[PDB]
Design an enzyme around this catalytic site. Structure first.
Site, PDB file in Angstrom:
ATOM      1  CG  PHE A 249      33.346  37.400  29.640  1.00  0.00           C
ATOM      2  CD1 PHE A 249      34.151  36.264  29.528  1.00  0.00           C
ATOM      3  CD2 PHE A 249      32.286  37.566  28.741  1.00  0.00           C
ATOM      4  CE1 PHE A 249      33.878  35.321  28.539  1.00  0.00           C
ATOM      5  CE2 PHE A 249      32.016  36.615  27.767  1.00  0.00           C
ATOM      6  CZ  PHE A 249      32.808  35.494  27.671  1.00  0.00           C
TER       7      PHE A 249
ATOM      8  CG  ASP B 207      53.017  38.596  23.527  1.00  0.00           C
ATOM      9  OD1 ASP B 207      53.556  38.426  22.411  1.00  0.00           O
ATOM     10  OD2 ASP B 207      52.542  37.657  24.183  1.00  0.00           O
TER      11      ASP B 207
HETATM   12  O1  LIG Z   1      42.606  35.607  29.603  1.00  0.00           O
HETATM   13  C1  LIG Z   1      41.741  36.479  29.673  1.00  0.00           C
HETATM   14  C2  LIG Z   1      40.452  36.393  29.070  1.00  0.00           C
HETATM   15  C3  LIG Z   1      39.553  37.426  29.207  1.00  0.00           C
HETATM   16 BR1  LIG Z   1      37.860  37.232  28.368  1.00  0.00          BR
HETATM   17  C4  LIG Z   1      39.867  38.573  29.930  1.00  0.00           C
HETATM   18  C5  LIG Z   1      41.100  38.676  30.506  1.00  0.00           C
HETATM   19  N1  LIG Z   1      42.014  37.664  30.405  1.00  0.00           N
HETATM   20  C6  LIG Z   1      43.350  37.777  31.018  1.00  0.00           C
HETATM   21  C7  LIG Z   1      44.315  38.453  30.083  1.00  0.00           C
HETATM   22  O2  LIG Z   1      43.844  39.762  29.846  1.00  0.00           O
END
Ligand SMILES: O=c1cc(Br)ccn1CCO
Ligand SMILES: O=c1cc(Br)ccn1CCO
Lengths: 262, 298
Positions: B86, B131
């Site tokens: 996170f 992207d």
């Molecule tokens: O969508 C999210 C948000 C966080 Br914070 C970490 C990973 N992902 C998936 C894409 O990396």
């Protein structure tokens, strides 16, 4: 130029070398399979060759699928009635990985002549993913071949196609190709192709790149040379048919050399 | 894998892709804050999506401090859970909400330097991101920034084959894609980072076009309309048209006025028309612009 990634080709080659070792099937697994045999595996792979040409799939996809299958059969025991189901799910996964436009699941059901249901194909898809732990970016013969090709002076499309052909033939026969890494079969195939078409030999520049010599390639080369000689007699013929096509410079019609001279 | 949903406590919803929702969650046993991406399969008729197959398989291999970490994958019959490290924010939100009077030059430099490390690592592992944009770069409280969202990413062969076209969010998309080129390579990711570099300085997109042809025109109006001299082959490219207006290259100090000479140099080499001359991530790490780079926190 950048299409040959000058700044990363070595890093990539090195990485692929470490990964091919991790993604290697068990050499002896067919003896540990109670109900299936090299012969049945050859039938499956030959079929996947036909599936690839009917759907005009990349060769890379074919190679990935065989990798998935062999790794799966290395830890999972399969009845002969289910071998095709594994192969189908393998091909589906490989298609979703490498293809711009993968065939839809229903097409995969269709090519099995309604031997299996869409539910069975999807559940097997999940099983393979579990067994491989999503580890799907596997080095193939093709990934090495395309790099080796950059060492031809000059590029010769008959060489390239013949090398691809020989490499594909090796997918059919677990004995004896399960015991060789993709990088090594690719090397053997490149030298044989080069020798067959132009008389030349595995270049020093590839010795530098790979650390492989004709010495180290010799075992594989002897097997590949036999496979090439007896290919018109092999029970499985779909690769030879595909390489008669002009896309591949009809290289299957070329004549194998009778000897290698070392 | 080494995990089950029982051990996570959902906290709030932090995001939503076309696959589903992302939640911030907490490991009840270790304390670890994570992001859970839910991918729903029960709703899926085509089994596990290719986007997810690529994201998982590719991210499993990419351990690097500037690439978000796939911690785990929880694999039920109905649902798929990607557990990620996170990070509190993305670069887009940061530029909008706190960079109102600017991102300080030390932090721009630190961020770009980290992004290049991350991308260099991708290219070295035969992965194109495809992207790169501010929304897909995550920042933490420690001053780290990390490439995220590998759903559009691809394992490449050497040399590259033809891959999917119209990849890369339009404002970040390289000319070679816009001109319909048969082949594209690692240079498409550098272009994106170039656009992002500029965007960090000004806090506004460098080429915000509203169609393929408008994107090309805005690029051409900034960098000049390319010809055979600057970019051999350009006029042969499938969607090159001779009728293209021929705009003069504007001096680069007018493109991003606040930028210093080193900055301008680096930027110019990221936005080179010719993908063959465009600088690599690996080479860019040595550019003089980074001579005094540190890692300041936001
Ligand atoms: O969508 C999210 C948000 C966080 Br914070 C970490 C990973 N992902 C998936 C894409 O990396
Ligand atoms: O039944 C099948 C079908 C295919 Br396709 C491959 C192998 N087997 C096992 C028995 O030959």
């Amino acid at each position: 130029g950048v299409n040959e990634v000058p700044d990363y080709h070595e890093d990539i080659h090195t990485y692929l070398r470490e990964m091919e070792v991790k993604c290697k099937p068990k050499v002896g697994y067919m003896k540990k399979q109670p109900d299936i045999t090299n012969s049945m595996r050859a039938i499956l792979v030959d079929w996947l060759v036909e599936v690839g040409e009917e759907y005009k799939l990349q060769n890379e996809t074919l190679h990935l699928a065989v990798n998935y299958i062999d790794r799966f059969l290395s830890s999972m025991s399969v009845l002969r009635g289910k071998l095709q189901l594994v192969g189908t799910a393998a091909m589906l996964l490989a298609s979703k990985f490498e293809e711009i436009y993968p065939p839809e699941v229903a097409e995969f059901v269709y090519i099995t002549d309604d031997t299996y249901t869409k539910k069975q194909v999807l559940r097997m898809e999940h099983l393979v993913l579990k067994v491989l732990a999503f580890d799907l970016a596997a080095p193939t013969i093709n990934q090495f071949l395309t790099q080796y090709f950059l060492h031809q002076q000059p590029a010769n499309c008959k060489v390239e196609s013949l090398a691809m052909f020989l490499g594909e033939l090796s997918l059919i026969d677990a004995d004896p190709y399960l015991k060789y890494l993709p990088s090594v079969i690719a090397a053997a195939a490149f030298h044989l192709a080069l020798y067959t078409v132009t008389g030349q030999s595995w270049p020093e520049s590839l010795v530098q790149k790979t650390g492989y010599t004709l010495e180290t390639l010799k075992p594989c080369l002897l097997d590949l040379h036999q496979t090439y000689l007896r290919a018109p007699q092999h029970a499985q013929q779909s690769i030879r048919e595909k390489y008669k096509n002009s896309k591949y410079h009809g290289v299957s019609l070329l004549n194998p050399p009778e000897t290698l001279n070392v | 894998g080494p995990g089950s949903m029982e051990n996570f406590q959902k906290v709030e919803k932090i995001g939503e892709g076309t696959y589903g929702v992302v939640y911030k969650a907490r490991n009840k046993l270790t304390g670890e804050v994570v992001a859970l991406k839910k991918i729903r399969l029960d709703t899926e008729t085509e089994g596990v999506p290719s986007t997810a197959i690529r994201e998982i398989s590719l991210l499993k291999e990419l351990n690097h401090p500037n690439i978000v970490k796939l911690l785990d994958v929880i694999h039920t019959e109905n649902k798929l859970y990607l557990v990620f490290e996170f990070l509190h924010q993305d670069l887009k939100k940061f530029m909008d909400a706190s960079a109102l009077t600017g991102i300080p030059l030390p932090l721009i430099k630190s961020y770009l330097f980290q992004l290049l490390q991350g991308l260099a690592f991708c290219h070295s592992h035969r992965v194109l991101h495809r992207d790169l944009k501010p929304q897909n770069l995550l920042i933490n409280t420690e001053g780290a920034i990390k490439l995220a969202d590998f759903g559009l990413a691809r394992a490449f062969g050497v040399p590259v084959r033809t891959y999917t076209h119209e990849v890369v969010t339009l404002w970040y998309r390289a000319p070679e894609i816009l001109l319909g080129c048969k082949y594209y390579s690692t240079a498409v990711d550098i272009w994106s980072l170039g656009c992002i570099f500029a965007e960090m300085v000004t806090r506004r997109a460098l080429f915000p076009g509203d169609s393929e042809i408008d994107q090309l025109f805005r690029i051409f109006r900034t960098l000049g309309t390319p010809d055979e001299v600057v970019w051999p082959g350009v006029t042969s490219m499938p969607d090159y048209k001779p009728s293209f207006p021929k705009w003069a290259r504007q001096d680069f100090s007018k493109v991003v006025p606040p930028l210093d000479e080193d900055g301008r140099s680096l930027l110019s080499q990221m936005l080179h028309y010719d993908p063959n001359k465009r600088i690599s991530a690996k080479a860019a790490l040595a550019h003089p612009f980074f001579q005094d780079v540190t890692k300041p926190v936001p």
